Amino acid sequence: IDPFEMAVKQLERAAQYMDISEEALEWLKKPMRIVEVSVPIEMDDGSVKVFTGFRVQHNWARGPTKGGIRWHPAETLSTVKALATFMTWKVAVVDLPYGGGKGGIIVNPKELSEREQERLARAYIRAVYDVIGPWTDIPAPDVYTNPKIMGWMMDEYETIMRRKGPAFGVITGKPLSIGGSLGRGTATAQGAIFTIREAAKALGIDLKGKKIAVQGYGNAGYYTAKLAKEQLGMTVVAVSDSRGGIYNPDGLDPDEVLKWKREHGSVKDFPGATNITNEELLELEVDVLAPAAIEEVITEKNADNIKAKIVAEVANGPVTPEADDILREKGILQIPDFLCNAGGVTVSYFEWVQNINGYYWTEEEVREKLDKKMTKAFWEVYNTHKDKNIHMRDAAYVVAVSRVYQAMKDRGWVKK
Numbered sequence: 288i289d290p291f292e293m294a295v296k297q298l299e300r301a302a303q304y305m306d307i308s309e310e311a312l313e314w315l316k317k318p319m320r321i322v323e324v325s326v327p328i329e330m331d332d333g334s335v336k337v338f339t340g341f342r343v344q345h346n347w348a349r350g351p352t353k354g355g356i357r358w359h360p361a362e363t364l365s366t367v368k369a370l371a372t373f374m375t376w377k378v379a380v381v382d383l384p385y386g387g388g389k390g391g392i393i394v395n396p397k398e399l400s401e402r403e404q405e406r407l408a409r410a411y412i413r414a415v416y417d418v419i420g421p422w423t424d425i426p427a428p429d430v431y432t433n434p435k436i437m438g439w440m441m442d443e444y445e446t447i448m449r450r451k452g453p454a455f456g457v458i459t460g461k462p463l464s465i466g467g468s469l470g471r472g473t474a475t476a477q478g479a480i481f482t483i484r485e486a487a488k489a490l491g492i493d494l495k496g497k498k499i500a501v502q503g504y505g506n507a508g509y510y511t512a513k514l515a516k517e518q519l520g521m522t523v524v525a526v527s528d529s530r531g532g533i534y535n536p537d538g539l540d541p542d543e544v545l546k547w548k549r550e551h552g553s554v555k556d557f558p559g560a561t562n563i564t565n566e567e568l569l570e571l572e573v574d575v576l577a578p579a580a581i582e583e584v585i586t587e588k589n590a591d592n593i594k595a596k597i598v599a600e601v602a603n604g605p606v607t608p609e610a611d612d613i614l615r616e617k618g619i620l621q622i623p624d625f626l627c628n629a630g631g632v633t634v635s636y637f638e639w640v641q642n643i644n645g646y647y648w649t650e651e652e653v654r655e656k657l658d659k660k661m662t663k664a665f666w667e668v669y670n671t672h673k674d675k676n677i678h679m680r681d682a683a684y685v686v687a688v689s690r691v692y693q694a695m696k697d698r699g700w701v702k703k
């Protein structure tokens with residue numbers, strides 16, 4: 288289904304749980320500014336190819352818009368608009384002084400050389416320069432897009448801007464050598480475990496010695512397992528990847544699992560474990576469940592079989608709304624998809640703060656600031672959930688849309 292229309296339907300669905308005027312809802316239904324540009328580069332052969340670029344600024348009531356740039360051959364303007372609309376609420380739920388944005392280029396980066404990729408990155412900046420800036424619109428890395436491209440784009444922006452202001456703050460996720468931030472690799476898992484600890488505290492259960500299962504072993508999942516087995520005494524009993532999964536109640540070492548997966552290409556046939564499939568491992572005797580691999584992994588056909596006390600949605604929407612309804616009545620606490628993994632955007636905000644201030648923090652400072660941000664955001668969502676008797680997703684939507692609506696009213700954009 289059309290991604291932008293799906294985002295609009297979710298906003299309309301959230302509107303019924305709060306007092307929002309119709310004019311503000313119509314304002315939030317459509318992006319404030321959309322830019323479509325031609326991105327021309329010269330290829331290695333010598334010919335000029337024209338690529339289609341996008342940059343969508345959904346809303347900037349609370350501050351400059353924030354969102355990554357995605358390089359995908361199947362990318363569409365509607366998808367970019369939907370992701371920018373989602374980013375608005377993603378930065379609103381954790382109380383960032385940001386609006387929502389998103390960019391994209393319809394390109395297959397697999398077929399571009401490193402010189403062609405640098406040319407594309409610089410041309411995109413040369414084309415969208417008039418709508419981006421450290422206080423206007425801050426891009427970020429996304430699908431098929433990385434810190435190297437961030438460095439190239441930042442250099443192009445600095446060259447155009449003639450070093451008048453802070454050119455590091457125009458983009459985030461860049462290498463440490465040029466305005467980069469510490470804690471950027473482990474941001475999402477750190478935020479996820481902070482929300483998990485807060486959820487356990489709200490449930491009033493001593494979380495040390497409990498069993499956790501993780502779907503996927505990427506940058507998210509592996510670090511989620513490490514940090515669970517790092518500083519809160521959370522016993523890992525199962526991990527998984529695309530190929531398969533393992534489980535053993537005696538205990539698992541995340542570092543030994545990672546090295547075995549790296550030296551063998553997958554976690555399958557891990558020593559001292561019996562291969563258990565992902566769909567079987569989701570239904571496991573665990574006290575914290577943290578799916579962190581893919582989306583749509585918890586559906587109607589498998590929602591009623593889950594037996595965990597806490598589900599932490601580290602992945603981007605791993606639980607369907609009907610599954611949300613099933614898991615809610617069972618008494619299972621869930622963490623909304625765009626609240627659990629907000630550590631990445633929070634640390635991008637921290638990087639932007641360090642760039643504009645010209646002063647850079649340490650790992651401990653970033654971790655502690657993210658601790659405060661995530662705990663406050665989770666408590667704000669959870670109290671709304673227990674006050675309005677609505678699901679966690681609905682409470683997070685109510686909080687974020689309420690913040691954006693209040694900013695819009697204060698600016699005078701809307702009266703009612």
Ligand SMILES: NC(=O)C1=CN([C@@H]2O[C@H](COP(=O)(O)OP(=O)(O)OC[C@H]3O[C@@H](n4cnc5c(N)ncnc54)[C@H](OP(=O)(O)O)[C@@H]3O)[C@@H](O)[C@H]2O)C=CC1
Binds near residue numbers: 602
């Ligand atoms: N900044 C972040 O890290 C953010 C992370 N997320 C989500 O976290 C997830 C992890 O991605 P990321 O952290 O970027 O790192 P990776 O993309 O490297 O992580 C992907 C992991 O998921 C596993 N996986 C893939 N397909 C399946 C499947 N069908 N069933 C089970 N496991 C599977 C992969 O196993 P294998 O190696 O065998 O393929 C791999 O371990 C993504 O879905 C992402 O959307 C959410 C918000 C942002």
